[PDB]
Design a protein around this ligand. Structure first.
Ligand code: HEM
Ligand SMILES: Nc1cc(Cc2cnn(-c3ccc(F)cc3)c2)c2[nH]nnc2n1
Ligand SMILES: CC(=O)N[C@@H]1[C@@H](O)[C@H](O)[C@@H](CO)O[C@H]1O
Ligand SMILES: CC(=O)N[C@@H]1[C@@H](O)[C@H](O)[C@@H](CO)O[C@H]1O
Ligand SMILES: *[C@@H]1O[C@H](CO)[C@@H](O)[C@H](O)[C@H]1NC(C)=O
Ligand SMILES: OC[C@H]1O[C@@H](O)[C@@H](O)[C@@H](O)[C@@H]1O
Ligand SMILES: OC[C@H]1O[C@H](O)[C@@H](O)[C@@H](O)[C@@H]1O
Ligand SMILES: OC[C@H]1O[C@H](O)[C@@H](O)[C@@H](O)[C@@H]1O
Ligand SMILES: C[C@@H]1O[C@@H](O)[C@@H](O)[C@H](O)[C@@H]1O
Ligand SMILES: [Ca+2]
Ligand SMILES: [Cl-]
Ligand SMILES: [Cl-]
Lengths: 464, 103
């Protein structure tokens, strides 16, 4: 009943409205919230825990799926070419698009009623959430079919199974390399990187690769990196009219913007050439997510940071000090003490007014309040939660790309040459991509290069 | 559970030969610390009015959002050293790792 009702009866845990709220003046109203599914329903023996519906590994499961029926329904089973099924109703300038998804209460149709464009079907259920996300998804779908046709030409004897698998295995490694070589060091910074992610030695069968209940919340640090507009760019990296700076409140679930507003190319151009929002202690998250999250598709605009905090409470997560204690970090008891840790007393006074004790600060709120590490975009505590989780995902992965046996010495040497700019080259009409590192490069043309200067993935090692 | 294998399963089953469900889809999360619920086992802090958490009342998530998160959209400081691709690979990455179903 959560979608409509304000009653706090299971499984509803609605966020009540404070007096003098900047948007919701009716205090009899609320923010809708469904309590996450318990791992053990109706129990009285076990302490409530939540479920992860996906594979914890960086195995490109958002492309391929985490359940066997979906994984089948995502492939093109009409031939032994080992490709992932594409949209049969539309294409982006000749280039491939994700298939549509048959949903009972499809939210993508609500973004533009007249356009009649539904949600996409990908390895993960959240594909159509923001066009920028659907772009990354479509780029990867094109990449699988790219690598699978390059492999059929090399090894024509190979069937649809070996083609799918081998291409999946390649993509799977590609996501790992981008993540560990380029993403994470820019998240953690050099020190935490050396601390939580020292040089991989080999697979440890005694490492728990599971996602910790905390990580689900801690990793939502990214909400501080969200910009309020979708920035689209033309062939010459210039604002694309009409609608160059579209408000995010209009892009959520706007799948029609990808189909009917010029495909993947301008979005990726915008993502490469626009800087991300910087987390500041007086500038945490934008009102596009704090006030208008899913405005077009819902009875009321949601507040993502409030949802994050209610979610940790739903999840039974301990407060700030307990997590600091866990991480081996000092636990401030007073306002002054807190002001010292955060290197900001203005914020600590603010946090103390709300919580009373730094023991009660909700994990996400605490984590995002911390001053950032050197050359990093997280504070000491989040660098710990995020670091630990990523090390477990690496060291506890039997199919980790660097693991002896997974690939050959040459195969490993070939995969070491991949980059996200190069993936954008091979799968779009974009001829000018970001100079590596892609995550640091944000200015056009100071930080840009031509396709020609980028070496491609040499599939020579795969020849049988 | 096969003794020799070249590829991952879709579900993540068999990545860990000793405890084969570890990392696999549709399973309970691991806990790094025991859960703090209002009744010790199921009700979240904030469920019952007047029930304090560690000696203090529970602040409304929206109230915290209003007072700490809130900032004017125009004052936005852009990252000098990070593209939006960085605040997007993160979301893509997140979707390879965890999804918490609700009813
Ligand atoms: C696309 C922009 C994004 C939107 C609109 C968005 C929206 C959401 C929403 C609505 C939820 C569910 C909130 C709840 O009910 O508790 C969610 C959860 C989440 N988000 Fe964001 N988010 C975005 C980007 C990101 C980014 C960039 C990161 C990380 C870098 C991130 C990490 C997460 C995680 C970990 C969760 C919980 C995942 C799970 O179900 O296990 N989000 N986000
Ligand atoms: N748990 C969630 C929830 C959301 C919100 C979301 C994403 N997709 N959907 C969705 C998808 C299909 C649908 F029929 C209804 C809702 C909702 C997330 N966005 N990014 N990561 C998310 N994790
Ligand atoms: C409410 C809204 O923005 N609707 C748009 C409309 O402006 C546009 O003309 C049409 C094109 O198919 O797609 C939809
Ligand atoms: C089918 C349809 O409505 N297409 C419209 C187009 O005619 C219009 O020029 C543009 C700007 O509104 O939006 C789109
Ligand atoms: C299957 O692949 C062939 C060849 O690429 C193509 O003609 C057909 O449309 C594909 N079908 C789907 C569902 O993608
Ligand atoms: O992760 C929390 C940290 O706590 C402290 C030590 O136990 C570290 O080994 C650990 O990394
Ligand atoms: O927080 C300190 C803690 O960090 C981590 C590990 O390097 C441990 O050995 C050390 O005790
Ligand atoms: O429990 C997760 C993590 O917590 C801390 C340390 O005890 C680590 O050894 C461990 O990996
Ligand atoms: C990944 C490993 O997990 C466990 C710890 O004992 C090790 O120090 C390492 O962090
Ligand atoms: Ca996965
Ligand atoms: Cl289709
Ligand atoms: Cl946990």
């Amino acid at each position: 009943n959560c979608e409509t009702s304000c009653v706090q009866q299971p499984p509803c845990f609605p966020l009540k409205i404070p007096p003098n709220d900047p948007r919701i003046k009716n205090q009899a109203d609320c923010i809708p919230f469904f309590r996450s599914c318990p791992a053990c329903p109706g129990s009285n023996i076990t302490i409530r825990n939540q479920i992860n519906a996906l594979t914890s590994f960086v195995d490109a499961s958002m492309v391929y799926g985490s359940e066997e029926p979906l994984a089948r329904n995502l492939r093109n089973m009409s031939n032994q070419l080992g490709l992932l099924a594409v949209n049969q109703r539309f294409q982006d300038n000749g280039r491939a698009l994700l298939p549509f998804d048959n949903l009972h209460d499809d939210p993508c149709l609500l973004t533009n009623r007249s356009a009649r464009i539904p949600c996409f079907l990908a390895g993960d259920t959240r594909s159509s959430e923001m066009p920028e996300l659907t772009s990354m998804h479509t780029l990867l779908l094109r990449e699988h079919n790219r690598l699978a046709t390059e492999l059929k030409s090399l090894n024509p004897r190979w069937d649809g199974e070996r083609l799918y698998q081998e291409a999946r295995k390649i993509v799977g490694a590609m996501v790992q390399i981008i993540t560990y070589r380029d993403y994470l060091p820019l998240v953690l910074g050099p020190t935490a990187m050396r601390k939580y992610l020292p040089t991989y030695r080999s697979y440890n069968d005694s490492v728990d690769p599971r996602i910790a209940n905390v990580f689900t919340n801690a990793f939502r640090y990214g909400h501080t990196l969200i910009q309020p507009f979708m920035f689209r760019l033309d062939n010459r990296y210039q604002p694309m009219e009409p609608n160059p700076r579209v408000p995010l409140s209009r892009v959520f679930f706007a799948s029609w913007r990808v189909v009917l507003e010029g495909g993947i190319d301008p979005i990726l151009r915008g993502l490469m050439a626009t800087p991300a929002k910087l987390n500041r202690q007086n500038q945490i998250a934008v009102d596009e997510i704090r006030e208008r999250l899913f405005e077009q598709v819902m009875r009321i605009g949601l507040d993502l940071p409030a949802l994050n905090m209610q979610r940790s409470r739903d999840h039974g997560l301990p407060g700030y000090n307990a997590w600091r204690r866990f991480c081996g970090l000092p636990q401030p008891e007073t306002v002054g003490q807190l002001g010292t840790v955060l290197r900001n007393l203005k914020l600590a006074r603010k946090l103390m007014e709300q919580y009373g004790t730094p023991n009660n600060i909700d994990i996400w709120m605490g984590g995002v309040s911390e001053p950032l590490k050197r050359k990093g975009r997280v504070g000491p505590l989040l660098a710990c939660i995020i670091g630990t989780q990523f090390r477990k995902l690496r060291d506890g992965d039997r199919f980790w790309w660097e693991n002896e046996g997974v690939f050959s010495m040459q195969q490993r040497q070939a995969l070491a040459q991949i980059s996200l700019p190069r993936i954008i080259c091979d799968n779009t009409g974009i001829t000018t991509v970001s100079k590596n590192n892609i995550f640091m490069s944000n200015s056009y043309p100071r930080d840009f290069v031509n396709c020609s200067t980028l070496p491609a993935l040499n599939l020579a090692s795969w020849r049988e | 559970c096969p003794e020799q294998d070249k590829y991952r399963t879709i579900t993540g089953m068999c990545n860990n030969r000793r405890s084969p469900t570890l990392g696999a889809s549709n399973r309970a999360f691991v806990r790094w610390l025991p859960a703090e619920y209002e009744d010790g086992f199921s009700l979240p802090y904030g469920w019952t009015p007047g029930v304090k958490r560690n000696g203090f009342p529970v602040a409304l998530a929206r109230a915290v959002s209003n007072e700490i998160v809130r900032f004017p959209t125009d004052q936005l400081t852009p990252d000098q050293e990070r593209s939006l691709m960085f605040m997007q690979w993160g979301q893509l990455l997140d979707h390879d790792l965890d999804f918490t179903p609700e009813p």
